[PDB]
Structures are given as structure tokens and as C-alpha cells.
Amino acid sequence: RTRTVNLYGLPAANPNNGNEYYEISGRFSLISLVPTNDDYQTPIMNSV
Amino acid sequence: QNYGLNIPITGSMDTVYSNSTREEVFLTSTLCLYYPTEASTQISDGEWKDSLSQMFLIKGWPTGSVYFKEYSNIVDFSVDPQLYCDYNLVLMKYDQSLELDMSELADLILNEWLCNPMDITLYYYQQSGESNKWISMGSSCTVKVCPLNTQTLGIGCQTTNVDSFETVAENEKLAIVDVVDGINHKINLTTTTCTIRNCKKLGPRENVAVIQVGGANILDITADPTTNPQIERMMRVNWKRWWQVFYTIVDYINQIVQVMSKRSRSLNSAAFYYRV
Ligand SMILES: *[C@@H]1O[C@H](CO)[C@@H](O)[C@H](O)[C@H]1NC(C)=O
Ligand SMILES: *[C@@H]1O[C@H](CO)[C@@H](O)[C@H](O)[C@H]1NC(C)=O
Ligand SMILES: [Ca+2]
Ligand SMILES: [Ca+2]
Ligand SMILES: [Ca+2]
Ligand SMILES: [Ca+2]
Numbered sequence: 473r474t475r476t477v478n479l480y481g482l483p484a485a486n487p488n489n490g491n492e493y494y495e496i497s498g499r500f501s502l503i504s505l506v507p508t509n510d511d512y513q514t515p516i517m518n519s520v
Numbered sequence: 521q522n523y524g525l526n527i528p529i530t531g532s533m534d535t536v537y538s539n540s541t542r543e544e545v546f547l548t549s550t551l552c553l554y555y556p557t558e559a560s561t562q563i564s565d566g567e568w569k570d571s572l573s574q575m576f577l578i579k580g581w582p583t584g585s586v587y588f589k590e591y592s593n594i595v596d597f598s599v600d601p602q603l604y605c606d607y608n609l610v611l612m613k614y615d616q617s618l619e620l621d622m623s624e625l626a627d628l629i630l631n632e633w634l635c636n637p638m639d640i641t642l643y644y645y646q647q648s649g650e651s652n653k654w655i656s657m658g659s660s661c662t663v664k665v666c667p668l669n670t671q672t673l674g675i676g677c678q679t680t681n682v683d684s685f686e687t688v689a690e691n692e693k694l695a696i697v698d699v700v701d702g703i704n705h706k707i708n709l710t711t712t713t714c715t716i717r718n719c720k721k722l723g724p725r726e727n728v729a730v731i732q733v734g735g736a737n738i739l740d741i742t743a744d745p746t747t748n749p750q751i752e753r754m755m756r757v758n759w760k761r762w763w764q765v766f767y768t769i770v771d772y773i774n775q776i777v778q779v780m781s782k783r784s785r786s787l788n789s790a791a792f793y794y795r796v
Contacts, residue, residue, distance in 0.1 A: 519642055519679075519706065 542774060546580050549782050551773065552587045552605035554597070556613055559762040560590065568766075575770045594618055598625045598694030599657050603728055604789040607777055609769065614734025622732075624696045627741045628655065630753060632725045632784075633792040635717035644668060644704035650744065651721040654707075655792075656695045658714030663689045663697055668704040682708050698743050719792060727784045729753040729776060733765060752779050 560568070569588050576586045587605055591597035594612060598621060610629065612622060635655065638645055647653070656663055664685035666677040677684040685708055689695035699705060709716050730753065732739065737756055740748050755776070759765045769776070786793070 517642070519644065 542778075543580070545777065545782065546585075547582060549777070550585045550587060550606040551576065551581055551777070552589065552603075552608050553769070554589045554591060554603075554608065554610045555762075556594075556611070557590055557592050558613065559611070559766075562762045572766060572770060575767075576773065579770060579773055581773075594625055595621050595693045598628070598692075599659070601625065601629055601791050602789040603629065603791060606727075606782065606785060607780055608728035609776065610728065610730045611765065611769075612730055612732050614732055614738070616735075619738050621692060621694065623739045623741065624694055626730050626739045626754065627696060627743070628694065629728050629791055630725055630730060630741055630751065632722040633719040634722055635719040635792040635794050637794075637796060638707075638716050638718050640707045640709050640711060640716060644706055645718060646704055647699055647701040647718075648720075649701055652701070653719055653721065653743070654697050654699075654716055655719045656689070656697065656709060656714050656716040657693065658710075659693070660710060661689065661692050661695050661714035661716070662687065662710055663695060663714075663716070664708045665697075665699060666706045666708075667699070668706065672704070674706065679706050696743070717792070717794075722793075724751070724753075725784055725791075726753065726781045729755065729780050731769070732756045733759050 560566075565571075572588070573583065573586050577583055589605070595618070608629070610625075612626075614622065633653075633655065638654070645654070654663075664682065664687045666674040666679055666685045668679070669675050673679075674684075677686060685706075688697050688699070707716070730739070732755065737750070737754075739754055741751065741754070742749060757765065757768060
């Protein structure tokens with residue numbers, strides 16, 4: 473009952489649309505650092 | 521000074537025999553037994569130590585001289601068997617599939633071994649000759665060897681892939697392993713539990729005697745297969761009742777110690793000479 477009809481978008485009036493939540497799945501890769509002194513790395517030693 | 525090691529002792533063939541010495545060896549030595557827990561369990565007692573001690577006293581040993589020791593079983597006694605004691609008699613119950621470990625224990629205690637340490641993760645190790653073995657003792661001694669050729673590359677096995685290593689004794693408490701003498705080897709032995717020593721075999725520890733209780737004579741103390749000598753210190757008595765076994769021991773103790781000797785005792789209760 474208004475001027476604005478057939479506009480593409482998503483207003484903030486009722487975004488949930490009766491849903492408890494919107495979900496998304498996927499894979500999540502990470503290459504972050506970490507301290508590992510438990511190695512105490514000088515074993516690759518040459519057995520002789 | 522030496523004790524006279526390189527000086528001859530001219531004797532004679534007409535000197536008269538000096539008289540008996542059984543009394544003095546009884547009054548000096550200390551007899552000592554190693555029996556399984558099964559023996560006490562079947563005896564169902566706890567004054568039996570006292571009864572046996574008094575029987576030995578009537579047999580001719582002073583009171584504080586017979587010492588009893590208990591081990592759970594042969595394989596568990598095999599892990600560092602410390603003979604804390606002077607005349608050792610190891611009663612040993614035979615049961616099938618314990619042939620090899622029982623023989624290994626008999627070898628280890630009957631013969632004197634000079635053992636050096638081994639650092640498994642670092643160095644390769646040979647066996648010098650016929651008298652050398654590797655003795656591995658601990659809670660779980662799984663031994664996997666990889667022999668190396670002239671080019672330091674394993675034969676039948678790659679030094680990197682431990683699966684290809686040839687297993688030579690798995691999950692024993694004691695393992696006396698021989699390998700072809702003159703080839704370097706890489707060993708993968710579970711260093712947390714088991715410890716492995718490079719042991720030469722000196723002459724016989726002619727103090728401890730082993731009394732097998734069950735089946736036929738099987739103890740091949742000599743790892744070489746061409747020879748299976750029978751030592752007088754390896755006795756074998758059939759049985760049904762542990763009380764009968766102990767009474768036989770007490771009755772015939774004089775003969776057993778006459779077979780054994782006292783001079784071959786070491787200060788350490790350890791069953792080998794650790795020479796670092
Ligand atoms: C040694 O034993 C013999 C056995 O007849 C005995 O005659 C002798 O007296 C003993 N030696 C000593 C010093 O008593
Ligand atoms: C033996 O191999 C296992 C294989 O996982 C390894 O974990 C262990 O560190 C190795 N031990 C030695 C002494 O090389
Ligand atoms: Ca292999
Ligand atoms: Ca063994
Ligand atoms: Ca050998
Ligand atoms: Ca043999």
C-alpha cells in the first residue's frame with residue numbers, strides 16, 4: 473500500500489523470517505604459529 | 521701385588537688328605553632358596569619358613585643362615601634377577617612354552633657375564649665372537665634388528681622404515697639374543713621400559729644351582745646348537761607336592777652344596793659385572 477514496490481534488497485523489518493537462525497557450513501584453514509619446545513630439536517641425529 | 525696369579529704351585533702326590541670340611545662350610549656359608557609364589561600358595565601356611573629353618577638346623581646349618589626368597593614366576597624373576605645371597609638354589613617349575621625363557625634365565629644366572637652399556641638410538645653394534653650376546657631386560661623387551669652391509673645400508677630392511685626391521689624377540693621380560701658375529705646392526709628397542717647390555721660370557725658362576733621341578737631336561741645353557749652339556753649344578757626332580765619337594769631339598773642339602781661352590785661369589789647381588 474505504498475509507492476515503493478518491486479525493489480531488490482532486504483529490509484531490516486523482519487530479517488529472521490520466523491527462523492531461529494541462518495546457518496552456513498564450510499572448511500576453515502589456519503596456519504598460525506605455536507610454541508613447541510617439547511621437541512628440543514636436535515634429534516635428527518646421524519646414527520653412526 | 522697380584523695374589524700370585526703367574527706363579528706355579530708345586531704340589532705333591534703323597535701328602536695325606538686333610539679331614540672333612542662340611543661342618544665349617546655349613547657354619548660359614550648361607551643357604552638360600554628362590555621359590556615361586558605357587559609354592560607358598562599350595563603350602564597354605566606361613567610358619568613354613570620357620571619349620572624349614574628348624575629342619576635345616578637339625579640338618580646342620582646354624583639358624584640365621586637359610587634365607588627364602590619368593591618370585592611371582594620364571595619370566596618375571598628374569599627381569600634383573602639379583603641373587604642377594606651366598607648358596608643360591610633356584611627352584612623352577614616347568615610348564616610348556618616357557619622352555620626358552622627358562623633356559624635363558626638358567627644361562628644368565630649359571631654363567632658369569634661381563635656387561636657393557638649400549639646406546640641404541642646412536643650407535644650400531646656388532647657381536648665380537650662366540651661368547652658375546654645382547655641381554656635385554658625390562659617390562660617389555662621387543663627387539664627388532666636391521667643388519668647393515670659394507671655400505672651402511674640395511675640388508676632385507678631399510679634403516680628408516682622400522683616395520684622392515686627383523687624382529688628377534690618380542691615381549692619377553694628377558695631376552696638373550698645372538699646375531700651373526702661381524703655385522704653392524706641398528707636396533708629398535710623401546711628404551712623407556714627395556715634396557716639392553718652387550719655381555720661377554722666369562723666362565724661359570726659355580727655358586728648358583730638350578731633345580732627344575734617338572735618335565736624333561738630341556739635347559740640348553742649353551743646357545744650354540746652343536747653342544748648341549750649337562751652341568752652338575754642343573755638338577756631335575758619330579759614332583760606333585762611342594763612340601764615333598766622342600767623336604768627332598770632339606771634332606772639332600774649336603775649333596776647339593778657339595779656340588780656347588782662358595783668361592784665364586786660376588787660383592788654385588790647383581791647377576792653380571794657392569795663395566796661401563
Ligand atoms: C681331622 O679328622 C680326623 C678324622 O679321624 C681326626 O682324627 C683329627 O683329629 C682331625 N683333626 C684335628 C686337628 O682334630
Ligand atoms: C622404535 O620404533 C618406534 C616406532 O614408532 C619409535 O616410536 C621408537 O622411538 C623407536 N625406538 C628406537 C630406540 O629407535
Ligand atoms: Ca624385513
Ligand atoms: Ca629370554
Ligand atoms: Ca653371537
Ligand atoms: Ca646348545
